[PDB]
Design a protein around this motif. Sequence first.
Motif, PDB file in Angstrom:
ATOM      1  N   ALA A 196       2.486   2.599   4.294  1.00  0.00           N
ATOM      2  CA  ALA A 196       1.992   2.486   5.661  1.00  0.00           C
ATOM      3  C   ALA A 196       0.507   2.825   5.738  1.00  0.00           C
ATOM      4  O   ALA A 196      -0.232   2.245   6.533  1.00  0.00           O
ATOM      5  N   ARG A 221      -2.243  -0.303   5.982  1.00  0.00           N
ATOM      6  CA  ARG A 221      -3.103  -0.223   7.157  1.00  0.00           C
ATOM      7  C   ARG A 221      -4.573  -0.303   6.761  1.00  0.00           C
ATOM      8  O   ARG A 221      -5.421  -0.703   7.560  1.00  0.00           O
ATOM      9  N   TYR A 223       4.290  -1.015  11.511  1.00  0.00           N
ATOM     10  CA  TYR A 223       3.022  -1.731  11.577  1.00  0.00           C
ATOM     11  C   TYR A 223       2.903  -2.509  12.885  1.00  0.00           C
ATOM     12  O   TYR A 223       1.838  -2.550  13.500  1.00  0.00           O
TER      13      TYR A 223
END
Length: 170
Positions: free
Chosen positions: A44, A48, A24
């Motif tokens: 992830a 996000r 990240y």
Amino acid sequence: GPLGSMADSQDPLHERTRRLLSDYIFFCAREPDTPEPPPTSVEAALLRSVTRQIQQEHQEFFSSFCESRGNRLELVKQMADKLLSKDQDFSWSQLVMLLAFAGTLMNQGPYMAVKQKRDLGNRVIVTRDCCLIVNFLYNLLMGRRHRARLEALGGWDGFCRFFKNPLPLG
């Protein structure tokens, strides 16, 4: 403790959270002239999608600090102490929050990025701060009680379904 496991090399989420968190940071530092790459895992991808909103909503103040005292790290740990804890029953919302903030602190200090040859165009401040900044959070959630609970609630998996992941996978 931040460490502790029954497996040596066959770690469960150990390298799963560390890699995800560090992933990240790089995405956040993504040069202003080049978009960041896609996610690596479900956490992830979802993070996000959700974490991105946590910043644009809060980052409004975080960013100001990222370039104020330069303690991008001091703030990363401080926050995790206010929201996340050891004897406190943290919440999924707190987990994703840490990721967003952490990356929001990611400061830069290049010279002439104008000439972006590749996607690696960025100072070492990212890698250096990424290890420390992520080292704090990673261990914060990768703790005995933290990690124990994180998974006890479905783990990274429960979050994807909790925050409804955009991608079909997971």
